[PDB]
Amino acid sequence: TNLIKSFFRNYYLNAELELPKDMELREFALQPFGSDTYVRHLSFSSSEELRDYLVNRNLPLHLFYSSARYQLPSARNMEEKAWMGSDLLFDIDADHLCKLRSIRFCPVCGNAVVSEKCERDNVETLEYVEMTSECIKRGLEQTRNLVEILEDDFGLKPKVYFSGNRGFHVQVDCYGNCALLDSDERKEIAEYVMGIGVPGYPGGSENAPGWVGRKNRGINGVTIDEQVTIDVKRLIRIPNSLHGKSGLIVKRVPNLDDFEFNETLSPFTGYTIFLPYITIETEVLGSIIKLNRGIPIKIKSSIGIYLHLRNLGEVKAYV
Amino acid sequence: TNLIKSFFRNYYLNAELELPKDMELREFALQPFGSDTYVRHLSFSSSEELRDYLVNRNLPLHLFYSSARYQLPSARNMEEKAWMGSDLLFDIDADHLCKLRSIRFCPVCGNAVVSEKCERDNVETLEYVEMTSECIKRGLEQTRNLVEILEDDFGLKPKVYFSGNRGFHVQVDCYGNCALLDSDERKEIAEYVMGIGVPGYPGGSENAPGWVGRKNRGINGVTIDEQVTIDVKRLIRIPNSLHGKSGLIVKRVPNLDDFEFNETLSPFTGYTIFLPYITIETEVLGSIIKLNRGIPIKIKSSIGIYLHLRNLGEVKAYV
Amino acid sequence: YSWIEKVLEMGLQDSRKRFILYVASRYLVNVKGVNEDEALQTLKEFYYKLQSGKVYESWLKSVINGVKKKGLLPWSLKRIEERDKEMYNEIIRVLKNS
Amino acid sequence: PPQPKKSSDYSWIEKVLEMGLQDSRKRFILYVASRYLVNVKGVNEDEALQTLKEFYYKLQSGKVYESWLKSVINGVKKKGLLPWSLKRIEERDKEMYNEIIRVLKNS
Amino acid sequence: LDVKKYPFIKSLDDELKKYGGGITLTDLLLNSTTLIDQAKDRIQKTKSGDELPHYVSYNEPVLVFYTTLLSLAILNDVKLIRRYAYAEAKQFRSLLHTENEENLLEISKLLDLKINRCDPIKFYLEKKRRIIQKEFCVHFIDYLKYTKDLKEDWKLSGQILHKGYVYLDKNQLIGLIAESIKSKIVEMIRPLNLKEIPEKLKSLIERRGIIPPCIENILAKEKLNEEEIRTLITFYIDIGKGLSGIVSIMKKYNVSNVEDLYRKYPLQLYFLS
Amino acid sequence: LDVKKYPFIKSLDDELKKYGGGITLTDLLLNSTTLIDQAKDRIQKTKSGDELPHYVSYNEPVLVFYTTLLSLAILNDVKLIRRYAYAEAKQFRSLLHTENEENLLEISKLLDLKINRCDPIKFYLEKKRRIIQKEFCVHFIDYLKYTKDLKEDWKLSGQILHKGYVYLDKNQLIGLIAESIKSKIVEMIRPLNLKEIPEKLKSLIERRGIIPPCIENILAKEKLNEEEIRTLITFYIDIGKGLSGIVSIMKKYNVSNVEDLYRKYCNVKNPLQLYFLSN
Ligand SMILES: Nc1ncnc2c1ncn2[C@@H]1O[C@H](COP(=O)(O)CP(=O)(O)OP(=O)(O)O)[C@@H](O)[C@H]1O
Ligand SMILES: Nc1ncnc2c1ncn2[C@@H]1O[C@H](COP(=O)(O)CP(=O)(O)OP(=O)(O)O)[C@@H](O)[C@H]1O
Ligand SMILES: Nc1ncnc2c1ncn2[C@@H]1O[C@H](COP(=O)(O)CP(=O)(O)OP(=O)(O)O)[C@@H](O)[C@H]1O
Ligand SMILES: Nc1ncnc2c1ncn2[C@@H]1O[C@H](COP(=O)(O)CP(=O)(O)OP(=O)(O)O)[C@@H](O)[C@H]1O
Ligand SMILES: [Mn+2]
Ligand SMILES: [Mn+2]
Ligand SMILES: [Mn+2]
Ligand SMILES: [Mn+2]
Ligand SMILES: [Zn+2]
Ligand SMILES: [Zn+2]
């Protein structure tokens, strides 16, 4: 009996996911627990049909629905699927941005180990990457620029979401001919946002339109993941679903100044007895925390589930 | 699993499913063999049309029709379907009731394994849970009280069915304003049956009406699966269909005292040579059977097909 | 809300249910505030203006109950035009042709 | 040698569009009708949508999305795709072929 | 059953027949000065949380009620309609606690409450210390409807259901009628945003003034100027007029400025204290 | 707006109404001797890379235009059809650089270009040394369409977008019209592989000769011989006839040899001298 599993199953019992109105036209997909391969070609017509599947049939470690709309979302033949438009997506990953503290180690002896196995214990090595709130700050600056471009240059109404782990998703609901844009036409928008072929406007005014004012406000291109925007058939991590690498909620950011990166992003109440793998002092959900190897410690569920899914240790019981 | 198909295909050739009279208003759905995605939005107007589809186009591992009545059962959009009432459903699972014997193991090396995979053979672990007949007995007590509440307090005429695996389904045909009841109004009914907000009537008479007599007859709330009753729309497992986890018949229970949990619930005649995964002694359809790992064994088809779909081994041939 | 009463009084053809679902029912209950049974009989009276076809009373009660419980507001002719152009064009022509 | 031709007779497409079909309405829209209405007859981009929708709803059991038809039209326009030959239809999809031939016999 | 105590029994049309015909309430409301003022009295009493007088303390009881509904409809404040329908139902409660059974069953029959007398039900609790009797029964499908918006005390699991019927005493029959009335009042206000209202009768109920000289300099030239347009609309916003009906009075003009004035979103002769 | 300068405004049917009715272009092309000769002149001028005369240097410009499209359709050479629409748009470019604003916006309205006048946009660059003005705006979705096949000068990241609209000057409005015309011509040639062509009108535009006696020795016996077939077909490949329409000409004969001849792909050389006249 996986204990993280029960947490996830309990959240999905009552959680209300943000689902599109034409729900039956999307392909749903999920990565189950203890299986590295996705289940796809799922289709549901109501949030209740979906909730039954997640809670009784296949509990999701990661949950997605397609940015694209299909006539037959469950068909495996692509021409059967009948692609009929997709939403415009952007994904800002703090990969390129900050480069964080990372530690590879053996979960049995607790030593820093470069290799993929440990010689003594003959166990595979885990890696822990420390997600600081300064990283989320830099990420949050990027999506602020992106919302500026999409609103002022393109006239669109984007929605911002916490990715659940290391950044933000920007999604534009578009229902007209905007949804029918080529993958090629989306690469033109992607390169505009990234400032790839944008000329420097060396001596302009900050109030100039488009990239003229923006370049003279000191702003340059937005570091997005281009392949996310180019793929017409991308999988959107569902808002209010749980990110299987953190246990956090994919949360709408309705005001890009009120966003704080702390435990409130997790929906888990109570406390968990947590068993660390190493003696480490790191920042976890905006709070510096000291863990001691092999020394059980009672912490909140949010912090325990997070540290578990980040390979720092194991949640042993719930109170 | 190629041979299991032939058994099921043979049963559905002659079996007569209990189908509602307004058949053309129901959405039919089924899980085919070897496919994790449901086929749904089917509609049929006669038991013969359904028979052709099941035998020639898509053989069901699980077969359902919707508790809801629709104008367009085959429409994929929910509001296109035009819901015009749905039946009242209850589902009694003997999960919570009995607490059974369970074994997680690797089907290749045959060892007890805590994890979801096995180190040596690189295969995911299967789980076998032993379904005893005392378990079905406890389940039968719950539905007995449930029929009492529905008949004596609500004045309804419920039908009881063996779920085909681990419990019973109770279904009330109602066509007036009972069919149009909210999920909110259905949650009120669900909580009444479960005794959630029912006050203890500490010194009353056993012959008092409603929950006054019932609480003084020693009976408390019924352990149902509330989300099955709360959901306004649900898939009813068709009576006389085969449950793909056991091979048993979804069988009408016309008398709640005469129900015995044994091989008579399965329709499979003959014997099958069965190859167990582990050395185990368990109760199977009320009859204890002893299996030895990797040692083929000649047992009845009913017991073999059952043990197959319960992950204990593989049916290798039919006699 | 003069057009809703005008479309209800004359009738439609193709988008009668999308009009009942998103406009007519929500208007008769959540703006005009008529009796629950008066809206059902009116929506049946409205639907059977083209006279070819059938709609179930159980569905109309279902639509009435759902907009009553959720306080749904009828679609604006602005929303009708952007989102469902087939429905819009049927309404605008019944307004132009009288 | 000189440049060889191909064909020029597309009268049957107009006959199938005018009458209707039954089982293979979408495979006909995707591989024949759309490519013909835009890249052979060269009708308006929006008029083809209005014609293809009118054609599909002859048997009426089923539905086709306006968004899908615009998508198919844009895709055949950008790639200059030409409608399938009655021989190529015959090798690949006999279910569709026999449904078309019956509409051809029925006149 | 006293119409003077329960005005909502008789329809508005059946009351307008005492005064010839064709004369709707909009007409009769201009003659009488006391009616509109009495309706103002109730609204001001619900804003301050005071009891509401029973409608028998009025000379024209039916009319005072509808013009209180019509005043509430014109003010168009939903959060106030809630307080009123609450307070108004609270007032009607007392009148119910003085009524006989046949009258209580008559009111419920007129509110579409399917509540009846039936074979009573007695049972003892705590070894016959407590006794409980119920002589009214409702079908459980109707009962769930009538308790859609009610507290936990009305939850179905706390009731006594037998053979499909929930059993109530008289005090519970009353509590359902009182809630059925709190709903009929909100439902009776919606069909009063129907016809147009003579905008003096409106501004009488609204306690307004007139439109000043500076405004009527504009209703003449039909072309105006530049600052004559930036201010012509910022006035119309302060009355509370909708976005649609503004462009219809000044026809033959620019819609590019209709945008720039929505983005904004003599005055002393209107906001009289 | 001068039809003499821009023939593609009028449809071919709307011009054939000047001549009573029922009379299609096939009729007028046999009466008129000048039309076919003028259409070949343009093609020959684009084959060598020379300028094309404006259609104002023609007495009937509309007819010269379509028969230049119809002639190109008959040759069925896409690599040249591309060259023509290219060259033809260059000719139309210069004419646009002489047209007033009011005319430029009407042509674009007829080419389905959704470009309009808007509130102009001024901004200074390099500390007010450079000035830049733009008074035409197109929605960015349309702009991405209109620049589908265009070079990097039109790439979106090099443009000025505000509230969803790309802002252009007159030279850019013209360059888009010039590209819209390069497309309208290729789109106007496809629906000319539609009708059958009285194969003398076909062979007139092709400038052919006749078919010699040895071939008409065959359209009579309806059974022929053996070597009378190997040469009857190896000739038919040299005309340029398709694989389908050939078996329909000689019916009631063997189709087993139709296969083995696809694999091939008085007078001396009897048919090939009387057909491919160097004229
Ligand atoms: N396995 C997967 N396949 C396809 N798309 C995926 C995906 N996992 C995530 N996506 C989507 O593709 C974009 C980028 O994904 P990733 O950066 O790889 C994971 P994520 O959901 O963004 O969280 P993370 O980046 O904080 O770890 C997002 O819009 C996300 O919704
Ligand atoms: N895969 C599925 N998808 C949707 N509904 C399903 C389903 N399998 C079963 N159901 C329905 O959901 C309700 C409860 O089902 P479950 O408790 O999850 C399994 P079951 O069919 O009742 O058998 P079991 O409980 O004896 O194993 C029933 O109404 C059943 O018909
Ligand atoms: N109840 C409903 N709600 C919303 N859309 C519906 C609907 N029923 C049908 N549609 C829409 O109508 C189309 C197919 O149904 P139709 O045959 O047109 C029913 P309709 O137009 O609503 O009323 P009708 O009975 O007058 O034909 C699709 O575009 C579908 O989306
Ligand atoms: N959009 C599409 N394009 C091409 N083939 C399609 C298709 N949708 C389905 N098919 C193929 O057509 C067969 C039946 O699919 P269907 O769902 O019945 C569409 P159809 O028969 O082409 O049209 P129709 O049912 O709308 O009249 C299958 O072999 C499927 O692979
Ligand atoms: Mn990401
Ligand atoms: Mn069950
Ligand atoms: Mn319709
Ligand atoms: Mn089909
Ligand atoms: Zn180690
Ligand atoms: Zn193993």
Author numbering:
A (entry chain A), B (entry chain D): 11 to 329
C (entry chain F): 57 to 154
D (entry chain C): 48 to 154
E (entry chain E): 3 to 267, 298 to 305
F (entry chain B): 3 to 267, 293 to 306
Text of the article:
Initiation of DNA synthesis during DNA replication relies on a specialised DNA-dependent RNA polymerase, known as primase. In archaea and eukarya, primase is a constitutive heterodimer of a catalytic subunit, PriS or Pri1, and a regulatory subunit, PriL or Pri27. PriX is required for primase activity and the protein is encoded by a gene that is essential for viability. We have shown that PriX has replaced the Fe–S cluster domain of PriL as the primase module responsible for endowing primase with the ability to initiate nucleic acid synthesis.
To determine a structural basis for the role of PriX in priming DNA synthesis during DNA replication, we determined the X-ray crystal structure of heterotrimeric PriSLX from S. solfataricus at 2.9 Å resolution. The PriSLX structure reveals that the six-helix bundle of globular PriX is docked within the concave arch formed by PriS and PriL, and is coplanar with them. PriSLX was crystallized in the presence of RNA/DNA and the non-hydrolysable nucleotide analog AMPCPP. Although no RNA/DNA was detected in the density map, two AMPCPP molecules were clearly visible. The first AMPCPP was bound in the active site of PriS, in what is considered the elongation site of primase12. The 2′-hydroxyl group of the ribose in the bound AMPCPP makes two hydrogen bonds to the main-chain carbonyl and nitrogen moieties of PriS L245 and R247, respectively. Interestingly, the second AMPCPP located in the density map was bound to PriX, at the edge of the PriX-PriS interface. The ribose of protein-bound AMPCPP remains exposed to solvent, whereas the adenine base becomes sandwiched between PriX and PriS. The side chains of the basic 72-RKR-74 motif in PriX contact the triphosphate, with R72 and R74 buttressed by supporting interactions provided by Y103 and D140, respectively. Alanine mutation of D70, R72, R74 abolish or severely impair the initiation step of primer synthesis, but leave unaffected the ability of primase to extend an existing primer, indicating that the NTP-binding site in PriX represents the initiation site of primase.
